[PDB]
Design a protein around this motif. Structure first.
Motif, short mmCIF file in Angstrom:
data_model
loop_
_atom_site.label_atom_id
_atom_site.label_comp_id
_atom_site.label_asym_id
_atom_site.label_seq_id
_atom_site.Cartn_x
_atom_site.Cartn_y
_atom_site.Cartn_z
N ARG A 26 -10.74 0.50 15.96
CA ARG A 26 -10.74 -0.22 14.95
C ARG A 26 -10.27 0.59 13.81
N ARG A 27 -9.33 0.29 12.94
CA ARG A 27 -9.04 0.97 11.65
C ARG A 27 -10.20 0.91 10.71
NH1 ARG A 27 -5.81 1.00 7.08
NH2 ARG A 27 -4.42 2.83 6.99
N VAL A 28 -10.49 2.03 10.25
CA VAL A 28 -11.67 2.09 9.44
C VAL A 28 -11.25 2.65 8.06
CG1 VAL A 28 -13.47 2.29 11.21
CG2 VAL A 28 -12.32 4.48 10.43
N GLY A 29 -10.09 3.22 8.03
CA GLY A 29 -9.46 3.66 6.71
C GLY A 29 -8.08 4.37 6.85
N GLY A 30 -7.64 4.77 5.65
CA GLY A 30 -6.22 5.32 5.59
C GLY A 30 -5.95 5.88 4.08
N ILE A 31 -5.29 6.82 4.09
CA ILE A 31 -4.84 7.68 2.64
C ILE A 31 -3.41 8.26 3.04
CG2 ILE A 31 -5.90 9.71 3.70
CD1 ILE A 31 -6.52 8.40 0.15
N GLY B 242 0.25 11.11 10.35
CA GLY B 242 1.76 11.24 10.43
C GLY B 242 2.34 11.42 9.09
N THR B 243 3.34 10.44 8.86
CA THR B 243 3.83 10.64 7.55
C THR B 243 2.81 10.23 6.40
OG1 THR B 243 6.01 9.80 8.39
CG2 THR B 243 5.68 9.70 6.02
N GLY B 244 1.92 9.12 6.79
CA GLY B 244 0.67 8.92 6.22
C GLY B 244 -0.38 9.05 6.85
N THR B 245 -1.48 8.87 6.61
CA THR B 245 -2.77 9.03 7.62
C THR B 245 -3.39 7.61 7.69
OG1 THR B 245 -3.03 11.34 6.74
CG2 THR B 245 -4.83 10.28 7.82
N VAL C 18 1.70 -2.91 18.39
CA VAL C 18 1.03 -2.28 17.12
C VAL C 18 0.73 -0.81 17.58
CG1 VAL C 18 -0.58 -2.71 15.54
CG2 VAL C 18 0.26 -4.50 16.70
N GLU C 19 1.08 0.00 16.58
CA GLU C 19 0.77 1.56 16.72
C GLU C 19 -0.53 1.95 16.74
OE1 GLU C 19 1.82 4.42 13.46
OE2 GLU C 19 2.83 2.52 12.52
N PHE C 20 -1.35 1.15 16.29
CA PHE C 20 -2.96 1.66 16.26
C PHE C 20 -3.37 1.56 17.71
CE2 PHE C 20 -2.94 -0.35 11.75
CZ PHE C 20 -2.33 0.86 11.18
N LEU D 155 0.63 -1.21 0.06
CA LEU D 155 -0.04 -0.13 -0.10
C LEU D 155 0.93 1.37 -0.07
CD1 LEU D 155 -2.74 -0.93 2.86
CD2 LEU D 155 -3.15 -0.50 0.32
N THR D 156 0.34 2.22 -0.67
CA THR D 156 0.82 3.55 -0.43
C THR D 156 0.60 3.89 0.72
OG1 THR D 156 0.36 3.75 -3.13
CG2 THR D 156 0.84 5.88 -1.67
N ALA D 157 1.94 4.47 1.51
CA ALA D 157 1.71 5.16 3.03
C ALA D 157 1.56 6.35 2.90
CB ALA D 157 2.66 4.48 3.69
N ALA D 158 2.25 7.07 2.09
CA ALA D 158 2.43 8.49 1.79
C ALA D 158 2.77 8.94 0.43
CB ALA D 158 3.57 9.09 2.41
C1 LIG Z 1 -3.14 1.96 -3.13
C2 LIG Z 1 -4.07 3.00 -2.23
C3 LIG Z 1 -3.53 3.22 -0.67
C4 LIG Z 1 -4.35 4.25 -0.07
C5 LIG Z 1 -4.30 3.54 1.22
N1 LIG Z 1 -3.18 3.58 1.92
C6 LIG Z 1 -3.19 3.55 3.50
O1 LIG Z 1 -4.27 3.26 4.18
C7 LIG Z 1 -1.76 3.38 4.25
C8 LIG Z 1 -1.82 4.99 4.75
N2 LIG Z 1 -0.83 5.34 5.60
C9 LIG Z 1 -0.99 4.81 6.80
O2 LIG Z 1 -1.86 4.31 7.52
C10 LIG Z 1 0.28 5.25 7.78
O3 LIG Z 1 1.31 5.87 7.15
C11 LIG Z 1 1.00 3.87 8.61
C12 LIG Z 1 1.41 3.01 7.15
C13 LIG Z 1 0.08 2.97 9.55
C14 LIG Z 1 2.10 4.22 9.15
O4 LIG Z 1 1.95 5.35 10.12
P1 LIG Z 1 2.75 6.86 10.12
O5 LIG Z 1 4.37 6.48 10.64
O6 LIG Z 1 2.14 7.59 11.50
O7 LIG Z 1 2.62 7.42 8.72
#
Ligand SMILES: CCCCCNC(=O)CCNC(=O)[C@H](O)C(C)(C)COP(=O)(O)O
Ligand SMILES: Nc1ncnc2c1ncn2[C@@H]1O[C@H](COP(=O)(O)OP(=O)(O)O)[C@@H](O)[C@H]1O
Ligand SMILES: Nc1ncnc2c1ncn2[C@@H]1O[C@H](COP(=O)(O)OP(=O)(O)O)[C@@H](O)[C@H]1O
Ligand SMILES: CCCCCNC(=O)CCNC(=O)[C@H](O)C(C)(C)COP(=O)(O)O
Lengths: 266, 266
Positions: free
Chosen positions: B112-117, B98-101, B69-71, A171-174
């Motif tokens: 619970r994790r419900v998403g990310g970006i 953070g670096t990502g969201t 686990v960081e969550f 997954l893309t993290a950032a």
């Molecule tokens: C291919 C589509 C990708 C979009 C979805 N991507 C995600 O859900 C990962 C977003 N990033 C994160 O959740 C965090 O950066 C994570 C990998 C938990 C690391 O936490 P952090 O060190 O705070 O950035």
């Protein structure tokens, strides 16, 4: 002839219907005067308008027009296209990726707006221009198609170096998060443009799958001219929708859903 | 002393507990080897680790260390900080920028994790660099506070020309979607940077608001070092949270939620 028009923020989509046969045409919103001039010269039985610049066309033409709200128009027209193209969906999200992005839940009977976001076609053009200085849409998008995002985007596995991550490492993290780690790389226009398309596709897909979960549907139908001449965008979206347990659909002439629906609502 | 460490993709957050007092330290993930050296020279009763680079620390330290686990760690520390600061929330979304969201629903029981970006701090830095050539985080974020996004972003009211819009006219319709209308001169670094922070803010908030509706909570708590030295980002996120009828919270030392939580979990 009957004419349906969806005059949006970037493109004017025109549908002409004569003898149960549709003709599709597009003009830039920047050339809205030419569309007006053309309409003033036609023999028209029905003129149905929608989208942001419907008002401008209706004000400037010498003939009567009907105006419809683009959300209902797009829903109606998409419903028509789905059935024409062999889809019998009981319900779905549809994500309209135009100048910007509007998200809708269709429950089988009608649509409601459930989301929106400014990551869309306009961002692709605008942020692409800032990173590449390319203004022509076709050149811009062509330039992105074989870009390499690896020196630009940070993946989960890059953060979880030597640690099992709690979500998929690929997954893309950032988005753009690897740039500061690759300052010796040539950030080519193709690589930069691929990353632009990547962030837009990821964000649109993330919003769509989130509302799909919310409204309890696995079906997500993607429309809008942002997918034209951009196979890479289609891939980013299609790949991540499937990875999130949803079913992506593209429809031929999906960008004309509003123009078609405007005619049917009348 | 007892030490909690959240070794993320960009910053290593260190909390030291001793004589009923906690001390905060930050180092760059770039310099993780220094952190490890420092740890190996300290007298540590208990070491608790979390984040993507926990494995690196854990491997090169000469004492046992518990890893979490960081969550869960972030949720625990956030809950501690919230309660310490006079917020008793039955439930909330928390968005870890953070670096990502990463996005979470805390129902009272657990998260619970419900998403990310991938729109977060790494994007602000990396796309910030591509648009300004600035690598210094403080310089970059400082420059952005004086930027205007009026010439870069397109609003709904720009698309619905001389016409009452179907959704609020002041909302961003397309991030960067106004660029192609303002090509006569160069775009300033401060304006470009404001636009970068604007889109990261809006994406994060739109996602947070959507999952808040989905999980039936009005409270959204925002944490992460991405908010450090960035009033613009705090503001973008707050305003749109309130606009969509939700209640935004920020905690003092929220970037240390994970590090504090690692300590509590041990
Ligand atoms: C291919 C589509 C990708 C979009 C979805 N991507 C995600 O859900 C990962 C977003 N990033 C994160 O959740 C965090 O950066 C994570 C990998 C938990 C690391 O936490 P952090 O060190 O705070 O950035
Ligand atoms: N020929 C084109 N010229 C400019 N943009 C195009 C073209 N074809 C596709 N696009 C893309 O489609 C987007 C517009 O999508 P569309 O659904 O037509 O929106 P709108 O109704 O707001 O005009 C543009 O922002 C751009 O990314
Ligand atoms: N001194 C700094 N150096 C670099 N980035 C910083 C600094 N202070 C704040 N930041 C911001 O915080 C982000 C990282 O946030 P954080 O929550 O610490 O993530 P992680 O746990 O992945 O390190 C960076 O991407 C940047 O936007
Ligand atoms: C302050 C955060 C803003 C995020 C919310 N923004 C929105 O929901 C608007 C997103 N954009 C859209 O819905 C479309 O661009 C809309 C305004 C319907 C115009 O349609 P189009 O011509 O296809 O772009």
């Amino acid at each position: 002839m009957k004419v349906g028009i969806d005059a949006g923020g970037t493109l004017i989509k025109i549908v002409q219907e004569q003898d149960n046969q549709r003709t599709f045409k597009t003009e830039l919103t920047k050339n809205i005067d030419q569309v007006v001039e053309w309409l003033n010269q036609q023999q028209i039985e029905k003129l149905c308008l929608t989208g942001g610049n419907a008002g401008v066309i209706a004000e400037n033409i010498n003939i009567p027009a009907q105006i419809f709200v683009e959300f209902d128009a797009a829903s109606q027209g998409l419903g028509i296209l789905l059935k024409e193209q062999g889809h019998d969906l009981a319900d779905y999200i549809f994500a309209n990726v135009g100048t910007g992005t509007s998200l809708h839940y269709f429950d089988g009977q009608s649509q409601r707006r459930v989301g929106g976001i400014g990551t869309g076609g306009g961002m692709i053009q605008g942020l692409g221009y800032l990173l590449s200085q390319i203004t022509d849409y076709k050149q811009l998008t062509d330039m992105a198609q074989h870009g390499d995002r690896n020196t630009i985007d940070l993946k989960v596995r890059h953060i979880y170096k030597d640690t099992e991550p709690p979500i998929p490492g690929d997954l893309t993290a950032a988005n753009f998060g690897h740039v500061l780690h690759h300052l010796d790389a040539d950030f080519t226009p193709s690589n930069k443009l691929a990353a632009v398309i990547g962030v837009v596709g990821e964000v649109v897909t993330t919003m769509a799958i989130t509302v799909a979960r919310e409204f309890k549907t696995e079906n997500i139908v993607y429309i809008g001219s942002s997918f034209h001449n951009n196979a890479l965008l289609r891939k980013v979206v299609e790949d991540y929708t499937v990875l999130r347990g949803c079913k992506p659909y593209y429809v031929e002439n999906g960008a004309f859903s509003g123009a078609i629906g405007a005619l049917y609502l009348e």
